[PDB]
Amino acid sequence: APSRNGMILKPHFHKDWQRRVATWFNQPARKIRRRKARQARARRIAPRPASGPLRPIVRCPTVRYHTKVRAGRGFSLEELRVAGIHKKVARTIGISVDPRRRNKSTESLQANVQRLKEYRSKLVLFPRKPSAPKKGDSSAEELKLATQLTGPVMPIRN
Amino acid sequence: MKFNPFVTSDRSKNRKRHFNAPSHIRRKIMSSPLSKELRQKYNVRSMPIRKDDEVQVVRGHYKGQQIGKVVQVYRKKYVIYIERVQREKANGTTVHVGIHPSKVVITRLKLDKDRKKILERKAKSRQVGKEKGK
Amino acid sequence: VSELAGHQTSAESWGTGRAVARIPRVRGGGTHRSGQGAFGNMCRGGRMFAPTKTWRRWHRRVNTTQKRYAICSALAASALPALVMSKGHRIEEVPELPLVVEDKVEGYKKTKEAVLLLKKLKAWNDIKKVYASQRMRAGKGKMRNRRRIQRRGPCVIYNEDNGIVKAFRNIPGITLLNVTKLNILKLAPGGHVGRFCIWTESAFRKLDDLYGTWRKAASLKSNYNLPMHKMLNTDLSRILKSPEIQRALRAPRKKIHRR
RNA sequence: CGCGACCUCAGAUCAGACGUGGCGACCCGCUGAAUUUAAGCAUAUUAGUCAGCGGAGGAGAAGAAACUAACCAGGAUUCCCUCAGUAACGGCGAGUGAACAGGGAAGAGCCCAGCGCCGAAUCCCCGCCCCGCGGCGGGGCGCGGGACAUGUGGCGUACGGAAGACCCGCUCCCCGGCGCCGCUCGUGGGGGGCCCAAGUCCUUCUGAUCGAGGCCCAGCCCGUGGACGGUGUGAGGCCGGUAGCGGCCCCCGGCGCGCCGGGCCCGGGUCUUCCCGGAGUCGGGUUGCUUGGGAAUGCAGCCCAAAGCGGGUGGUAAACUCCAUCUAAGGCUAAAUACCGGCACGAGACCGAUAGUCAACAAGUACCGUAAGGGAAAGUUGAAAAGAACUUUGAAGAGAGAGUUCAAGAGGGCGUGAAACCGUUAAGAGGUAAACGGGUGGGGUCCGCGCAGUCCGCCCGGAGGAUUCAACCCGGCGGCGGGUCCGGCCGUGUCGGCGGCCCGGCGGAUCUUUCCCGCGCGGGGGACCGUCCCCCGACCGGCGACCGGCCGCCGCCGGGCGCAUUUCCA
RNA sequence: ACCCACCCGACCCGUCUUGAAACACGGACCAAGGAGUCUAACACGUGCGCGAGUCGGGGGCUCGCACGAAAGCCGCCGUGGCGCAAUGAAGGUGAAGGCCGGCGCGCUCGCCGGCCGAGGUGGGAUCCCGAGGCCUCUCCAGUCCGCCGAGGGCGCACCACCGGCCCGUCUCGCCCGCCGCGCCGGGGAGGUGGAGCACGAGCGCACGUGUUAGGACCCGAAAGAUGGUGAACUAUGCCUGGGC
RNA sequence: CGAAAGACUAAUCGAACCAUCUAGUAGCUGGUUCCCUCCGAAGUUUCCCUCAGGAUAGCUGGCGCUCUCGCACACGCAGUUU
RNA sequence: CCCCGGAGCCCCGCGGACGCUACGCCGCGACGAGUAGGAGGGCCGCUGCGGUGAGCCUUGAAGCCUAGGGCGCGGGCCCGGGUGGAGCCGCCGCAGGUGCAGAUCUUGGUGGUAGUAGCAAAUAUUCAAACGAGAACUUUGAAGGCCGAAGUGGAGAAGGGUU
RNA sequence: CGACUCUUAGCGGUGGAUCACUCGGCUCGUGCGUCGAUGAAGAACGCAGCUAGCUGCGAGAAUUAAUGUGAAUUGCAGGACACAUUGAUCAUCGACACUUCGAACGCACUUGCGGCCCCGGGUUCCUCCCGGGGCUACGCCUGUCUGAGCGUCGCU
Ligand SMILES: [Mg+2]
Ligand SMILES: [Mg+2]
Ligand SMILES: [Mg+2]
Ligand SMILES: [Mg+2]
Ligand SMILES: [Mg+2]
Ligand SMILES: [Mg+2]
Ligand SMILES: [Mg+2]
Ligand SMILES: [Mg+2]
Ligand SMILES: [Mg+2]
Ligand SMILES: [Mg+2]
Ligand SMILES: [Mg+2]
Ligand SMILES: [Mg+2]
Ligand SMILES: [Mg+2]
Ligand SMILES: [Mg+2]
Ligand SMILES: [Mg+2]
Ligand SMILES: [Mg+2]
Ligand SMILES: [Mg+2]
Ligand SMILES: [Mg+2]
Ligand SMILES: [Mg+2]
Ligand SMILES: [Mg+2]
Ligand SMILES: [Mg+2]
Ligand SMILES: [Mg+2]
Ligand SMILES: [Mg+2]
Ligand SMILES: [Mg+2]
Ligand SMILES: [Mg+2]
Ligand SMILES: [Mg+2]
Ligand SMILES: [Mg+2]
Ligand SMILES: [Mg+2]
Ligand SMILES: [Mg+2]
Ligand SMILES: [Mg+2]
Ligand SMILES: [Mg+2]
Ligand SMILES: [Mg+2]
Ligand SMILES: [Mg+2]
Ligand SMILES: [Mg+2]
Ligand SMILES: [Mg+2]
Ligand SMILES: [Mg+2]
Ligand SMILES: [Mg+2]
Ligand SMILES: [Mg+2]
Ligand SMILES: [Mg+2]
Ligand SMILES: [Mg+2]
Ligand SMILES: [Mg+2]
Ligand SMILES: [Mg+2]
Ligand SMILES: [Mg+2]
Ligand SMILES: [Mg+2]
Ligand SMILES: [Mg+2]
Ligand SMILES: [Mg+2]
Ligand SMILES: [Mg+2]
Ligand SMILES: [Mg+2]
Ligand SMILES: [Mg+2]
Ligand SMILES: [Mg+2]
Ligand SMILES: [Mg+2]
Ligand SMILES: [Mg+2]
Ligand SMILES: [Mg+2]
Ligand SMILES: [Mg+2]
Ligand SMILES: [Mg+2]
Ligand SMILES: [Mg+2]
Ligand SMILES: [Mg+2]
């Protein structure tokens, strides 16, 4: 029964909720586990960025977010076509590619081509064998860095 | 402290480990120090006590400077019986009184081949550590 | 306490009319446990009233500035010999109270060195008093791996472990902190404010970079400064018998007019 | 009335394979209540919840848009935070209740049918040889069988694809083995084994010490080891361990190099000519369940039942109309995620034997019930069994002595041993049941005395003894306080240096792209402003923030002062 | 404080009840056990930190965690929450006024320059000014220090009242605007609905009380539902035997 | 199942027994654990499928705040009376 | 018409308690019933945690018992003696499965009732001996009785499970 | 004084509270994440020199082998062993073994009845008889063999 003034309030504890309470005593143990697993994955992908692949710049949807810009899922095909990277290869050099992205405006396209161009400049493709063929960079830019890149690769700053 | 996160430091766990210990493991638990004399000679602190070592009792009632030969090792009872360490029961019969190995000192070892190789292994590890410390 | 604790029986009440007492009683059988008393918080067997749960709100989370304020407060009173002595630490013969030292002390790799240091600095008599305190705990925590108890010793704030934290380790009483990762649980143990510490010049320099002086930001904790003071002249005895104030007070009526 | 193809079907203890039951914490598919709430109750709620059935895996399920949106647009699934107790549902009552965006954890994408081209270019099983054989594989050779054109394999799947011509640039990827090299993060991966510091030092307590005092620096020695346990009490140093990028030995993994056996002649852009999509499905009607989904969110049965610039979606039914957005009716896929079952560990501000699991113990035991099922009680001699030899009374159980033990005022259900209740011993009482409150008395029990308790302490006066000094200077040390702020260090407010300003850094939506570097933007200079630091002078708060001299005062030590002083004692 | 005596007083507690010593219930005695908990949500109060902000989660970076599943830090420091703005069902709209001078006819209406800038009344702790005393060992002069202070002021918070502004709504009216002159858009006056504005008070953490949802202070139904076990008793049928 | 008594169905029958949903619900019985101190009620209101209960007023406590002046220098208020 | 490092002081403004844990200390008035209920303070009490007591403890901890000595209004507390034989407490903070006379409360134990009710269905026992520590009850012998072949006899079924 | 009753205390009983211990629980976390026709889980019955229960094992039955370890096991016996030797005793566990029911498999649940191949006694393949051994569940797939049909054809 209500007594003199207060929010006529509806709690949702009518089902058997104590049967499905989910505690968080994991979380520290979890946080570590992720972190180990993270450091392992770095070490496996030895000079490759820990991050992942490079990802496009992309505007959010809706009037609300609109003004901001994130990393997207992957670079469109037009953006790869214009940059001149064969889509099947782009995956092999650490360039995210989605193929479901349309491309409406040319301002978002040329920006994302520029991204890939810049990436290709500051990328150090190792040759397949220690014996060096084409494409593969010099042993100077190799000895001076077989270095991983900490954090997201070429980060987007709005 | 102990930092190894697979050891135990848990009364109940250590005691259970102890009392329900298997024979070969008890051998190690039932170890006893060498006399300073042997400590000098072999480069070994202590040794797993055995059926017919010569031994002094260091503490208790039977604490004394006599050197009694070991009689048997009752690993179930965590104890060793020693030559003249005994007590007359009600009806005259002598009964070998138990002494815990660690409250005893080995003056003379019973050296077999295996005991010889053990002492060679312990002395070598001791001198490796002194070389590492230096 | 376990969920099933107390309810693993199947027990119905013999209703009224049997004399007895309307409790659920164990059902059937030819044992002692039959027609007993199940479930009730009062019964043997039974079920504790409001069995304890795991999702009691164990952890407790504190505003970050407040945490810092405490840690500044503890530091500030690690000065002040009175507050250090009152917190028990035998700091009688120590040379200077915010005790800062050479930075070879990063070097040491052996307790030998670390103890010798503490004896020259006259901080050993705290460690000595730690040994003296080592005794058996009172009661049930004895049988739950809290069997021995003792004093807290000298804190030792270092800037970098170059070997130090190995050296001071077996010396009972000592806790080692990084400067860059200070902790109020250790600087104010018991929630009690004083505590004799021992600084390393590298670390003791770094404090102002960590906490920021009054006219400079932290420069290491993004957006932070010291907490400002509410009153500046703390010694009110210096205030109250000033010229300025005693000039302006009526003369103290102090006769005692008894009945 | 034969023999032979195939088709559809049988039978074999035919050859060789698989499936069956279990477990069930987590997971997938069905099925599905009612207590309950609504202060009654029927819709609602409880709840797609319990019980029921089915099937799994180390996870499962989901998943590469017939998606979101309506933006300047995002771009598989899962998970968290948020959205949000919101939009919505609801006897619009009780109550119930999502999604997108946004930020994270993770991150990975693919394959068919079809349409087409390629002598079925494909697959399975036989049998002979060489290797390899405890996850039946490679290579070769057989007019040795069969599957297959009612369609196997290569190319290829919407992100387009194929075939053609010339623009370009050049040719490592995989597996079956056989070796060999570096033992490859808790700082030598995983498993096993066996190892590694220092007191039983001196006294002393004790039944026994691991105690208490000491030991070239809180005492000796180690300390990368003062976790824990054990050992006749409380142990860094007695023992096991503990610490350590410590050691050795096994085995196994994982990755590096060499050789062999095979396979494998595997691109890209540019222009032309062709090629292109899953039907009793979508969709509609419907009835029933379901959903926040409301003129139908999703799933169903039944009836109708399609199209190809089609189809689906675009959260209010319909018609017209533009836009946007996917491409359904076939399939595979690690990861972040779950885990009251299992194996193996670690920990605790938990419980400490009526608690904590039913269960510390020969517990799912005994015991009960025809059966489904129900389900207890119960830990502790002692350091050591040293568990009471022997004598004696008794048929014996039981005693009495003796002995063991530090103790049996620890005697095998024995640590401690409360209360109820009982026996006795001592004291006291007693016809209104006892017991009680208040108030005295009497007696007991002990406790404090006194064999004067006249209790102490100051100061003084006296008479007796007693050693040395106060007072006084002198020499030394230490302390305080002071102003002349005297001299110098110290710091507050102000002014002067524009002096740190570039030899002072950060911050800024201040400016400049006259600059530099990298691609109009990023980074760095360069101006500018705000903030923080050097130089000296002046004024002032001269501040417990200190030094140095000088002064005054105090105290201590040492000198002197021998007795109208000086303490002591009675 | 043990016992005994005597005088006076004196019914057995718990509980429900207008009323219990009750011929009202519970209670032979002792031991141990035994009932307002925890989570979530709200509100108010209080304490602390920061303050037009605040915030910490969730995530991440720092360690093998001995103490650590802590502690620290983060252009994540703010995605986001709450807060800093309302009001309307909604499309939407959205908290300023005054004064002065000029120009439109000052038309209590429309447009252009200057100044002030959150209105005013009453009461308001408190500050501020202060005539004037009141003396000083003498007659006057006379700066310094108070004590009081009649009288007069600025007036916090808060309260009451009157003005004003914003949104909804009505009534009455007259003008402005332009890429689109329109069933376009904008304003004015006067009422009246709003959980509004009128120089901000919140955010986070902690404790307390209260109120709820949960087993929800502890014990208690008759019932309801799902899935299983029993016809060894007994009820009836049938088969095969026995008995009078 | 009943030659019918609601009989019998393992000492249980006007719906057996076992386990679970289940700690089912209870406006109703019962109980509800230490001391001192200070304040101290109500059984009346209106509404209720309300009359053995709630709601709402009332009566209680707690926390306060804002002012007042015995610091020779007071305004307001009342279970009165004039 | 002079200075307290000296007026000698009932007031002393030069410096200030024996007193001043300022959550302290002190003075004046007034008042004090209390269920339900509310609030405050508890150097009241229980168990565990961080601090802290150079705490206590085999030269005797906890518990237990006490016609011993005291304190407190009280919750309670402290000492003496006994018993016991290994751990335990004070202070400052934090935490809670924190205080019992009741619940026809739960589990265990113990009384009064009480040496009481009771050991009465179915006719029946007696003598001697043996064994034996011991005989109303065993065994043997003798006598007297009953079941009276629809049996208190002689054999099975089911059920028991070594009787 | 007498007995009895009441009260207090001493000592003794009864009883098992309290306190102190704890090879057990309860909770939180970590890693791994493995059963079965090659017979699972579960049940049964067995097995020790003296052993009933718990445990441990399977007719090789408180265990065999192997490897590691290096003198015990022990309630009492007895023994072994040369503990200068594959070597006691534990641990590991890779080889071996694993009675009967049970998905449970020749068919039945009596522990009853069988069939079919081979072997030893029995014969001198004489079938009997006895003993041993190996097969003999259902479903399903790929093949194989034998077939069936006024199913669709062809040739004769
Ligand atoms: Mg990432
Ligand atoms: Mg329990
Ligand atoms: Mg205790
Ligand atoms: Mg299965
Ligand atoms: Mg209802
Ligand atoms: Mg109800
Ligand atoms: Mg009803
Ligand atoms: Mg529902
Ligand atoms: Mg279920
Ligand atoms: Mg899957
Ligand atoms: Mg799909
Ligand atoms: Mg999405
Ligand atoms: Mg919200
Ligand atoms: Mg629902
Ligand atoms: Mg094809
Ligand atoms: Mg010990
Ligand atoms: Mg130790
Ligand atoms: Mg050692
Ligand atoms: Mg529904
Ligand atoms: Mg619409
Ligand atoms: Mg799938
Ligand atoms: Mg027990
Ligand atoms: Mg017990
Ligand atoms: Mg128990
Ligand atoms: Mg006990
Ligand atoms: Mg006992
Ligand atoms: Mg006990
Ligand atoms: Mg004793
Ligand atoms: Mg005893
Ligand atoms: Mg006893
Ligand atoms: Mg004991
Ligand atoms: Mg008497
Ligand atoms: Mg009533
Ligand atoms: Mg009545
Ligand atoms: Mg009464
Ligand atoms: Mg009456
Ligand atoms: Mg009643
Ligand atoms: Mg009664
Ligand atoms: Mg109790
Ligand atoms: Mg508040
Ligand atoms: Mg309220
Ligand atoms: Mg509640
Ligand atoms: Mg109930
Ligand atoms: Mg019903
Ligand atoms: Mg019924
Ligand atoms: Mg209840
Ligand atoms: Mg009622
Ligand atoms: Mg009051
Ligand atoms: Mg009172
Ligand atoms: Mg009360
Ligand atoms: Mg003991
Ligand atoms: Mg607790
Ligand atoms: Mg009681
Ligand atoms: Mg009688
Ligand atoms: Mg017979
Ligand atoms: Mg007595
Ligand atoms: Mg017991």
Residue-wise DSSP of A36-52: HHHHHHHHHS-SS-SS-
- SS3 state at A83: helix
CB neighbour list of residue B84: distance below 8 Å, 6 or more residues apart: B66, B68
Nearest nucleotide over every DNA/RNA strand to the C218 CA, judged by C1': D506
Residue C146 per-residue DSSP state: -
- Exposure string over A35-58, b if 16+ CB within 10 A, otherwise e: eeeeeeeeeeeeebbbbebbbbbb
Is C174 buried (19+), middle (13-18) or exposed (0-12) by CB count in 10 A?
buried
CB neighbour list of residue B133: distance below 8 Å, 6 or more residues apart: none
Residue A131 per-residue DSSP state: S
Is A56 in contact with A76 (CB distance < 8 Å)?
A: yes
What's the CA gap between B76 and B94, in Å, rounded?
A: 21
Widest CA span in chain C? 95
DSSP result, A47-80: SS-SS-SB--EEE-SHHHHTT-EEE-S-B-HHHH
Task: List bases in chain D with any atom under 7 Å of a protein Cβ.
Answer: 45-49, 65, 68-76, 85, 94-97, 100-110, 159-160, 169-173, 185-186, 194-198, 200-201, 207-210, 217-219, 223-232, 234-235, 238-244, 246-247, 257, 268-269, 325-327, 336-340, 345-348, 350-352, 354-358, 364, 366-369, 373-377, 383-390, 403-405, 518-519, 531-533, 544
Residue A90 per-residue DSSP state: H
Residue A92 per-residue DSSP state: G
- Please report, as a single letter, which amino acid is at residue C44: R
What's the CA gap between C23 and C37, in Å, rounded?
A: 6
- SS3 state at C100: strand
Å from the A115 CA to the D105 C1':
26
Q: How many CB pairs under 8 A join A and C?
A: 4
Provide the pairing of β-strand C175-178 with C155-158: parallel
Nucleic strand G contacts from chain C, 52-111, CB < 7 Å: 52, 87-88, 90
What's the CA gap between A138 and A127, in Å, rounded?
A: 9
What's the CA gap between A24 and A30, in Å, rounded?
A: 10
Tokens of C116: 């010798």
- SS3 state at A106: helix
| Residue listed under structure tokens 């901001």 | A68
Is B53 in contact with B46 (CB distance < 8 Å)?
A: no
Q: How many residues does this entry show for chain B?
A: 134
H or E element, residue C135: strand C135-136
Residue B65 sits at the chain C interface (C-beta within 8 Å): no
Nearest to C172 by CA among C215, C117, C231, C131: C131
Name the minimum distance, in Å, from the CA of C88 to any CA of chain B. Answer: 25
Name the minimum distance, in Å, from the CA of C142 to any CA of chain B. Answer: 9
Residue B11 sits at the chain C interface (C-beta within 8 Å): yes
**CA C112 from centroid of its chain's CA atoms:** 29
Torsion angle of alpha carbons A7, A8, A10, A13, nearest 10°?
A: 90
Nearest to A83 by CA among A57, A109, A49, A122: A109
What's the CA gap between C7 and C38, in Å, rounded?
A: 8
Distance between Cα A64 and ligand 45 center (Å): 64
Residue C101 per-residue DSSP state: E
| B11 to chain C: closest CA residue | C145
Q: Per DSSP, which regions of C170-259 are E strands? A: 175-178, 199-200
Nearest to C23 by CA among C4, C40, C46: C40
- SS3 state at C13: strand
Nucleic strand D contacts from chain B, 70-129, CB < 7 Å: 77-78, 87, 89-92, 95, 97-98, 100, 102-103, 118, 121-122, 124-126, 128-129
Mark whether C and B touch (3+ CB pairs within 8 Å). Answer: yes
**Which partners does chain B have (≥3 C-beta pairs < 8 Å)?**
C
What was the structure determination method? Answer: cryo-EM
What's the CA gap between C196 and C80, in Å, rounded?
A: 10
Is C171 in contact with C151 (CB distance < 8 Å)?
A: no
What's the CA gap between C126 and C197, in Å, rounded?
A: 11
Torsion angle of alpha carbons B76, B82, B85, B89, nearest 10°?
A: 50
For residue B82, CA distances in Å to B25, B45, C102, C167, C228 come to 22, 21, 59, 45, 77
Q: How many residues does this entry show for chain C?
A: 259
Å from the A12 CA to the D1 C1':
89
Is C85 buried (19+), middle (13-18) or exposed (0-12) by CB count in 10 A?
middle
Which chain B residues are Cβ-neighbours of C169 within 8 angstroms?
1
Nearest to C75 by CA among C193, C158, C221: C193
**CA C1 from centroid of its chain's CA atoms:** 28
B3 φ/ψ sector (left φ>0, alpha ψ -120 to 50, else beta)? alpha
Mark whether A and B touch (3+ CB pairs within 8 Å). Answer: no
| A20 to chain C: closest CA residue | C55
What's the CA gap between C129 and C116, in Å, rounded?
A: 17
3-state secondary structure labels for all residues of chain B: CCCCCCCCCCHHHHHHHHHCCCHHHHHHHCEEEECHHHHHHHCCCEEECCCCCEEEECCCCCCCCCCEEEEEEEHHHCEEEEEEEEEECCCCCEEEEEECHHHEEEEECCCCHHHHHHHHHHHHHHHHHHHHHC
Tokens of C3: 């969920």
Tokens of A107: 């301002």
Cβ neighbours around B17 below 10 Å, total:
12
**CA B26 from centroid of its chain's CA atoms:** 10
For residue B102, CA distances in Å to B24, B57, B60, B74, B106 come to 17, 9, 12, 14, 10
